[PDB]
């Protein structure tokens, strides 16, 4: 149980991410780039501010929030979102809303794997990173 969020993680595998992005409405080309990328995600904490830094990908991002507190974000595929992240039993639950629509991204540490599961409507993807 030193297996906590804080850290850097290296992409390992992916399942169904193509159809999850189709569901989000991401363009054919941006989907291409997202499916070849092998991102590194670094999560850090300072006081009560969490910073998720996504690197080694086609467009690097960085998002800082407090749990329970609404934030704005322009995503890598250029949506203008509203978000609320909360935490429960080790799982960070992110509800991201834009133009009437919603996706839920959940992240949980499993033995130095970070497992990120994204759902929108009917469609789920799982991505697995490993502790760099
Ligand atoms: C953010 C990862 C970089 C590779 C995909 C790139 C950009 C994403 C663009 C459109 C769909 C959003 C995917 C990222 C979801 C949270 C990260 C993850 O599932 O880990």
CB 6 within 8 A of CB 130: no
CB 126 within 8 A of CB 16: yes
Question: What CATH number does the domain containing 56 carry?
Answer: 2.40.128.20
- The partner residues of 41 in beta bridges, in order of sequence, read 9, 54
Q: Which of 16, 54, 65 to mutate to test the pocket of ligand 1 (most atoms within 8 A of CB)?
A: 54
CB 95 within 8 A of CB 102: yes
Closest residue by Cα to atom 17, ligand 1, is 116
Q: Which of 75, 106, 114 to mutate to test the pocket of ligand 1 (most atoms within 8 A of CB)?
A: 75
**Does 52 contact ligand 1 (Cβ within 6 A)?**
no
Q: What domain count does the chain have? A: 1
Overall resolution, Å: 2.2
Measured from the Cα of 39, ligand 1's closest atom is 3
C-alpha dist (Å) from residue 66 to 51, 98, 100? 9, 20, 24
How far is residue 118's CA from residue 116's CA, in Å, rounded to a whole number?
7
CB 110 within 8 A of CB 3: yes
Q: How was this structure determined?
A: X-ray
How far is residue 20's CA from residue 73's CA, in Å, rounded to a whole number?
19
Tell which residue, 54, 87, 53, has the closest CA to residue 69. 87
Tell which residue, 68, 63, 35, has the closest CA to residue 51. 63
**Cβ atoms < 10 Å from Cβ of 105:** 19
Its domain, for residue 107, covers 1-132
Tell which residue, 40, 85, 82, has the closest CA to residue 61. 40
How far is residue 47's CA from residue 109's CA, in Å, rounded to a whole number?
21
């Amino acid at each position: 149980m030193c297996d906590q969020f804080v850290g850097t993680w290296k992409f390992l595998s992916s399942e169904n991410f193509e159809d999850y992005m189709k569901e989000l409405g991401v363009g054919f080309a941006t989907r291409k780039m997202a499916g070849v990328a092998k991102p590194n995600v670094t999560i850090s904490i300072n006081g009560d501010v969490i910073t998720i830094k996504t690197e080694s990908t086609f467009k690097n991002t960085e998002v800082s929030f407090r749990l329970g507190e609404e934030f704005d974000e322009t995503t890598a595929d250029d949506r203008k979102t509203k978000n609320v992240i909360t935490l429960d039993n080790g799982i960070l639950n992110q509800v991201q809303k834009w133009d009437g629509k919603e996706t839920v991204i959940k992240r949980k540490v499993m033995d130095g794997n970070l497992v990120v599961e994204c759902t929108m409507n009917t469609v789920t993807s799982k991505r697995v990173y490993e502790r760099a």
